[PDB]
Amino acid sequence: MKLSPREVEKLGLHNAGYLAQKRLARGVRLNYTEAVALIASQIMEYARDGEKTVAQLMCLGQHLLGRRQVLPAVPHLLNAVQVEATFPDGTKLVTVHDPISRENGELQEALFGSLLPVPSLDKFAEDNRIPGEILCEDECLTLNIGRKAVILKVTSKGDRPIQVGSHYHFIEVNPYLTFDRRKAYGMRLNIAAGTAVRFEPGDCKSVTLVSIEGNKVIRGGNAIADGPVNETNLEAAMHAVRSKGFGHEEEKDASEGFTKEDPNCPFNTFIHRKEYANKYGPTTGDKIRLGDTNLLAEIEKDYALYGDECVFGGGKVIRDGMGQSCGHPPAISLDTVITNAVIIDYTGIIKADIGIKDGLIASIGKAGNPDIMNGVFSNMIIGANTEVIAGEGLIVTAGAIDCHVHYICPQLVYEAISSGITTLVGGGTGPAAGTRATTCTPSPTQMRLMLQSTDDLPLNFGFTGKGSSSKPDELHEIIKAGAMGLKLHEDWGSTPAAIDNCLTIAEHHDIQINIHTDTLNEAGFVEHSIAAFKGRTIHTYHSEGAGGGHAPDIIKVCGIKNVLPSSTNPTRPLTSNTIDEHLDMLMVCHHLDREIPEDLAFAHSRIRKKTIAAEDVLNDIGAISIISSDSQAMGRVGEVISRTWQTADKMKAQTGPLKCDSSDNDNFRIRRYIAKYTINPAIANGFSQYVGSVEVGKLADLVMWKPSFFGTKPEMVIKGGMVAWADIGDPNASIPTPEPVKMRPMYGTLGKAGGALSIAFVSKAALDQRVNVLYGLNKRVEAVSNVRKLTKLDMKLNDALPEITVDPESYTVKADGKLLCVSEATTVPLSRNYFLF
Amino acid sequence: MKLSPREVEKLGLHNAGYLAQKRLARGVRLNYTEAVALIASQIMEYARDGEKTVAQLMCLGQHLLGRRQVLPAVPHLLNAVQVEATFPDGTKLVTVHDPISRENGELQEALFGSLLPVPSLDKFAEDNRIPGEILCEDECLTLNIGRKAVILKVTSKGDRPIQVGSHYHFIEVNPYLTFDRRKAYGMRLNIAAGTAVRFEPGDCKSVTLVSIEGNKVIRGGNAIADGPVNETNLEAAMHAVRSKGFGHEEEKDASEGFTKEDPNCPFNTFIHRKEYANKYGPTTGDKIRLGDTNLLAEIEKDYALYGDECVFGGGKVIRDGMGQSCGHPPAISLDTVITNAVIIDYTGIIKADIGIKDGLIASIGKAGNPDIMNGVFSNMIIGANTEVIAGEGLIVTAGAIDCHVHYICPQLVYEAISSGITTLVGGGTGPAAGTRATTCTPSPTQMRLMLQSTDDLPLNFGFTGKGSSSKPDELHEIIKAGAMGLKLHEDWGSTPAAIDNCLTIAEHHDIQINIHTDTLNEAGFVEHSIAAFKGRTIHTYHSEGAGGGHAPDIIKVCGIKNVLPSSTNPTRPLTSNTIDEHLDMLMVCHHLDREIPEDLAFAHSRIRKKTIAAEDVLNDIGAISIISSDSQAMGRVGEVISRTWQTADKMKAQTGPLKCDSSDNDNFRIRRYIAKYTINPAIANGFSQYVGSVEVGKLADLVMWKPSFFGTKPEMVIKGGMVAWADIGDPNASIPTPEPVKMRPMYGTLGKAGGALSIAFVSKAALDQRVNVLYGLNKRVEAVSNVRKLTKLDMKLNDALPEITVDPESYTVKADGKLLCVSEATTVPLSRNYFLF
Amino acid sequence: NKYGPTTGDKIRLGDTNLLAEIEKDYALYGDECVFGGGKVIRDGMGQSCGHPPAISLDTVITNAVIIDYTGIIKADIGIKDGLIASIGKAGNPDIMNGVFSNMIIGANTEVIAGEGLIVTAGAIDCHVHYICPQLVYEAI
Amino acid sequence: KLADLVMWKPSFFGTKPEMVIKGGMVAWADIGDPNASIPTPEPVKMRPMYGTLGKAGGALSIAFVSKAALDQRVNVLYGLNKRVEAVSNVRKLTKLDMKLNDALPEITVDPESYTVKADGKLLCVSEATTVPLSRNYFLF
Ligand SMILES: [F-]
Ligand SMILES: [F-]
Ligand SMILES: [F-]
Ligand SMILES: [F-]
Ligand code: NI
Ligand code: NI
Ligand code: NI
Ligand code: NI
């Protein structure tokens, strides 16, 4: 066959389309992903037949699926389907624009090539949100306020078109434009940033110009007017204008004035909030729906000065001497700017540019060129040597940190980062039974091997040893070898003697302890494990207890001041299938028999609707501080972020806004919940100064999301300032977006680049020995610290300490004497609209 | 399921077969690739049923597809389909020989297992070339001319068969052959190289022997006659013959003589051109059709001496003391010989062996053993320590060099090398918006990361910085950091001040500048960008301008002496879909709106049938010197080579042979066009002494092609003398060729081998600092040089400088006052016959 | 005495009888690069504030008498990345004539004082028997 | 075995060798004035040779470690250029494995007078007043 890579991939695309076709043919209403697969396959298939032109297929592709053949969100999510195929005249790109345009598709075309029977239209079974929609006040913003302004008539004397962008220095324009150049001096177009004015040959247009600001220095263009704006340079400029034959005509009566907040000022340019949000993403007071959830984030503040947005592209702001600075030392250029980001972080929901430098978040604020813009700090300068990542219309969050990882296989790593996880903490050696059961890398030789093994992967890693020992001796060894924590597990013994010894070791090494308690109550009840803590900081894994712990009341630890409690993700949130699914999973994990009374009694003591219901409420009120995966050992590595948001959405639907919430937005609840997979894991494990939030000085581990896929499938995952993984389409295609679009590894995964972007977290004892040198590690190593004086009060926005009781017979859970109930949800968002399977 | 790798792949093969089956079932005539997929799947499926033997399936597989169910080229391209499957008696290999043998296939068998309705035969819709066919004069060649000859009767006294190859020293044969050993001394069989004479027990055959030549030294075999051929060694040999009991009988009247050019000489052996080409590939005067194009390459010269071809295999020439030399110092053995290559290169279309040593092309000429062959130079010796790559019947070219690469994702790299690209020049950091738009690695920290990232990939890389600056300061930094070029782009500002500053920097650093000019004419028209060049060397990207530049006349730069102009590939050549496809692509890239008059006027100023038509003609006459991809930023990384050949084929069909062409072949046009993706990119960017042609002293970056897939899908890509990527079939199979055959990475991609085979091109400033040491790079680094005194006259075979005018209203293009028109093509070769999608 | 000698002056080589005459001098009298307190190579004076950081010399040897088979001359010697970058008149183009852009002394430039000294290429001994390491030290 | 070999003049045997060869390369040797026309003019001193420069020393030698240490590849952990090998076969040794020094006399020692006997016979030797390999060779 001699298949090239693209042929192999297109076969894959075609198989997804055929799955979508079979589903269509029995009357399924296709989700977004199925609809793309089908339309894109059908375009390839029509191309194979050789009878349809590109222009014909642009039309045919909008006839394939009707509103009634797809889910209600599809016409909203789906703007275009692109694919390339071999026509009789070679590879061509087809874009099918707005493909869901009719009520009913031409199902014979939708099914063309499939040989499937065409279903009758009544087979498709009969209100819905717009995922990621932007809500805006009906209002206009005023651009470039507080500047000198002039209106000039500009005539083209050219025989070819001339188009001039918002931030081009107007005196430097093409000599074949004629206008008052003296009055254009130090001025630029008063138009939306990144837009342009077009002059066809011979046209006259009046334009409004406003003065450049900041230090007011002109650079670049034709070097007509190069230099700081002042009288001497104005004269030199006009001399060059005449000398060089640039068109000039005095316009003695050109109106002059200022821009001001005033809807009647003839110098003003205005832009409606709706269009401002389409161009730049939204600004203060606007709201954003997160994915297809019910949660609304309001922008709390915006660093932008309207009119001076850093937008990159042809005609646009980020160009030599315009938005791109010519007046600063080379060493202070940013490495990268992410322009116009909506930042969602536990510190706030804001709108800002993000400066990246040496792999770090260098600055958050207003970026660009101090020579023509106000408000640009000297750590947010965009220079020749700066890359641009376009954040307009996107949300940017910290990368997620999963601190309950079982290192069972390498493939969960890939699964984790393609979902927005950039830091893994846990243990394991691969799929050994010890690892399948517990987050433990037991042997110093395995700690070495795991660190060498993961050294080129672009994520930060922490490995935990086996803390289940009554003696300190071996624990010192695994910690010196590189352990940044220890994980006590009932499967190796979580008895009071092990607990206490392990904690004493933690006190000495300044590492965090993670515990899965004694389910069996063999050595004690939960109050006896709490007594063995002796007041010392400890992290309780899966605190609700389905994933493990004192039956049935381990969840009591959520009221214990020196406990940092996490949830694992598969109980998040309580839904219709949760209990059946979890009971059987437990029986599978434990090799239990439904026909043995004691086995079934064991399982029922462990899988409990009431504690799991309580766990929804505890998360919501901030009494559980972290969500984590338990990857392949009861939980799901790619669902840390989506389970978090599904819990918030559930609690909002059932209990309404939090106390602390406003009633126009869900900001407080959003900040509380994002903290669960960002900052709190980093605090708990002792590395919050490096990662876990969008804050200056930290690693630029950042994730980009479309609001419509927020919480489910990110656009791109940035690791230490470089793209590590991202959605990208057919590698052979003319552009990056034609099908199949898949999450794929990027340059941050090749060679040893991964190590240059990341940190392996180890203990102090290990770094004092320079384990990184001993082990020939290319990844940076840092020691975890400051984890032995933590309490629940240090968990950001999840510092609640209700007194928790659990009836030992009925399992009823109460917090400060009140029932913790929530019914099961029958559906969750961030699922059916997005997943192919 | 416990799927092993082969099971996963066979599922893939089966899915391709089922695609082919659905297509068959609606009446599609299958292309070569679909037909292989279907036949191979059906063989597996019949094997699964367990009722058919291997021998039955060898027969059944020739009944599946008729001539009417496949495209006209399929019976020519398809010689055998092989696959292995699990029969009731375990894995077996089935080869279906010559599968298209009937008019009409047994479509119920073709569809067996599919549950698809069997289409009636009238569903398949009704002159064609043989892709890669060899055209030969009807003539015989004479072997081994100018040698002493003898005819000896040889009788087997053995009870088992004895077969003796063309270049075995005849006195050393099995003792159980009886003949005149005295007259066999220093002689070998006068038969086609690599063939053999078989002696069944008791048989007598007369054979013609000719003397060995070169230094005439016998080595190996039975050590009967070891040593230089002379009287003393003859006597020693006959003594050993008698002593050792090797069969000998004097044949007093054996005819003796010489070989000579003379059709009547009874000592001569002759071979028809057709068979000589089947065994060795073609020789002087023969022609080869390139793929399924209309282009014919004639072999201009051949280094072979007929009869002494280096052919490797059982019985064959390359064996101890025969074609494989025992008389030379170990250090002068070749590392590898590619035997019997048709070389297509801008320097000529020739037939030669290629010697490889230390990763370099060591020699091009006649290889083998100077002890028995004439004409073997001491740099083309095949020794014990030499590997063989078989080039007979194949074409060998330099690896392609794409010098407009946007480093948008790693996957385009794989796409590039699997198509025959071994060198990438461009810029980017991954899928950042800056990179998606422009070939720029802006930051020194990204230059470091990109070099580390690509350090183990087996291709040569050059990275370009952002040259769009009016100040030199930051440009010095990105160049010192490793930039081997700078890419000025209108999206960062391509104004005269940036242009001039960037060029002044180039003058100092001896790096090439690549430019995408000011489309908008914002700062000037094309004549104003040309004035800003001030006569200095510059490379204009996508010179025709659809991919970007002064609207609408950027293509004028093709007449500018100090301009090195390239095309990008998606406008190559003008076909029926080109304009519709490109207009919409531009609207997608620029986020433009069909409903806004200025937007559509912008697009129509940019996407122009007349300039694109002109661009076909300019390429053809050598006024555009390079073709390049623009990978994922308007162009296609895997189509650099095929778009080149489709342009040549188009121009030949429309305008006939070039002036400079003979009328029996297309050599001149072939040499002109291959130069576009080989030597000229290397000259333009300053590294032509390392790569860019099949010439002694350069890196052995070489690609092997079947003539029938020339220009589309290569056999194997050799990187610095080692196979980097190659077609290979089922990894579990008994041989390398059973389905699925896919282009796959080879040993040159594992460990750090990739770096040992390649070069990262950097600036002089960067190498003076030893950036390779600073950055811990394993790949070799060399500095680019000699790019600041280049003009169009240095572009090999593409040195035309017509004066170009462009009507600013109608867009009509003229070269020296003559219209440049060509109509659109409705089809192109190198597409439909080859691609699955 | 201050700068070493200039065109037409002669120098006796060691205690031999051989006299080297300076054949030419790149200096413009008055603008010699001399480093020390009160001296020429100081911020914004002989030491340039107007050029890109990457084009500062690594080191300048100021006022060298060069003896070489190519000629006996008087010049500053610019060093950059371990290479002889330029030979001529060094300093600051913002206050001096004749300073080429490859002989700029910047903040990031070291000074070696050549005034009154002769500068030659290092010698190359091409008949060395590598009998012990100590002859290496003796040689350099 | 490793070519760790020492060269001696018979007249200085046992006192001052000519040259010490380490893994086949001269490591240290008598050599005279490094500037001299030949290798032997005064002062002749024992001096380090090429085997002591750069990392050559490691290419000529072995660091002996335990089996446990080599099983962990301590040489890699510690970035050692010297070869490492594990010692072995030392737990079944007796005096009988000491080459030419395998005597096992029964030894008694009077605890008061300290008289030593081997198989019941007095072990006496008077003190020597002089020794060879001293006064003829040493400067101090
Ligand atoms: F678990
Ligand atoms: F767990
Ligand atoms: F482009
Ligand atoms: F481009
Ligand atoms: Ni657990
Ligand atoms: Ni777990
Ligand atoms: Ni371009
Ligand atoms: Ni491009």
Curated annotation (Swiss-Prot), chain C:
Subunit structure and binding partners: Homohexamer. Other oligomeric forms may exist depending on pH and presence of salts.
Role description: Urea hydrolase involved in nitrogen recycling from ureide, purine, and arginine catabolism. Is known to be highly toxic and lethal when given by intravenous route, producing convulsions and other signs of central nervous system intoxication associated with the high levels of ammonia formed in the blood of mice and rabbits. Is neurotoxic in mammals, when directly injected into hippocampus.
Family assignment from sequence similarity: In the C-terminal section; belongs to the metallo-dependent hydrolases superfamily. Urease alpha subunit family.
Positions annotated to bind Ni(2+) 1: H127, H129
The species this protein was found in: Canavalia ensiformis (Jack bean)
PTM notes: Carboxylation allows a single lysine to coordinate two nickel ions.
Protein name as catalogued: Urease
Transmembrane segments: none
Tree of life domain: Eukaryota
Additional facts recorded: Was isolated in 1926 by James B. Sumner. It was the first enzyme ever obtained in a crystalline form, demonstrating that enzymes could be proteins.
From Swiss-Prot, chain D:
Protein name: Urease
Complete-protein stretch covered: 701 to 840 of 840
Note: Was isolated in 1926 by James B. Sumner. It was the first enzyme ever obtained in a crystalline form, demonstrating that enzymes could be proteins.
Changes after translation: Carboxylation allows a single lysine to coordinate two nickel ions.
Subunit structure and binding partners: Homohexamer. Other oligomeric forms may exist depending on pH and presence of salts.
Function: Urea hydrolase involved in nitrogen recycling from ureide, purine, and arginine catabolism. Is known to be highly toxic and lethal when given by intravenous route, producing convulsions and other signs of central nervous system intoxication associated with the high levels of ammonia formed in the blood of mice and rabbits. Is neurotoxic in mammals, when directly injected into hippocampus.
Family in the record: In the C-terminal section; belongs to the metallo-dependent hydrolases superfamily. Urease alpha subunit family.
Superkingdom in the source lineage: Eukaryota
